[PDB]
Ligand binder design. Structure first.
Ligand SMILES: Nc1cccc(OCc2ccccc2)c1
Length: 171
């Protein structure tokens, strides 16, 4: 069976218990923690690309009020479709399965300023999603995988000082 497992799930859960936050900037900011997954059950002989996108979690935005995240208003129109292609793509099943797949270079932004960045709306919640795309396939068969442990709110600045401290502790 195809199995995609989240790496460092206990680390993600430490951030999720606080409500995770990722900084967005004009020029784009890398994530901490980094999304990394282990993969088994691909065809080692076949070629695949790995894609990452971010799914909006809510029909509303969020606000940090008195140390609590609470619903913060109606949402902005959805961010444009942004897909990140894992730079090892395309590659053999054997390549993807031999070591965890790390999305360490993806950049989150709040301005369409190019550079293969992901545009996100500030104070909106997102959930990372990985797609495995088989190459040379007439059926164009693509598997998707959500990681609920990795949900976060996009912010221009950290709201929760416990998140600021965690980011420094573990990074
Ligand atoms: N791509 C793939 C390869 C081998 C087994 C496989 O499991 C069948 C399946 C699992 C989960 C959702 C839908 C279908 C999927």
């Amino acid at each position: 069976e195809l199995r995609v497992g989240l790496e460092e799930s206990e680390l993600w859960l430490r951030f999720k218990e606080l409500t995770n936050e990722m900084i967005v900037t004009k020029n784009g900011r890398r994530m901490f923690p980094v999304l990394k997954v282990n993969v088994s059950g691909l065809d080692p002989n076949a070629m695949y690309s790995f894609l990452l996108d971010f799914v909006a979690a809510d029909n509303h935005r969020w606000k940090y009020v008195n140390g609590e995240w609470v619903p913060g208003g109606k949402p902005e129109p959805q961010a444009p479709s942004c897909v990140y292609i894992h730079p090892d793509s395309p590659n053999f099943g054997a390549h993807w399965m031999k070591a965890p797949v790390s999305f360490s270079k993806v950049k989150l932004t709040n301005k369409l300023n190019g550079g293969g960045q992901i545009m996100l709306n500030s104070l909106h919640k997102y959930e990372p999603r990985i797609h495995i795309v088989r190459v040379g396939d007439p059926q164009r068969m693509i598997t998707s995988h959500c990681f609920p442990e990795t949900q976060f709110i996009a912010v221009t600045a950290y709201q929760n000082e416990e998140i600021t401290a965690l980011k420094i502790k573990y990074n």
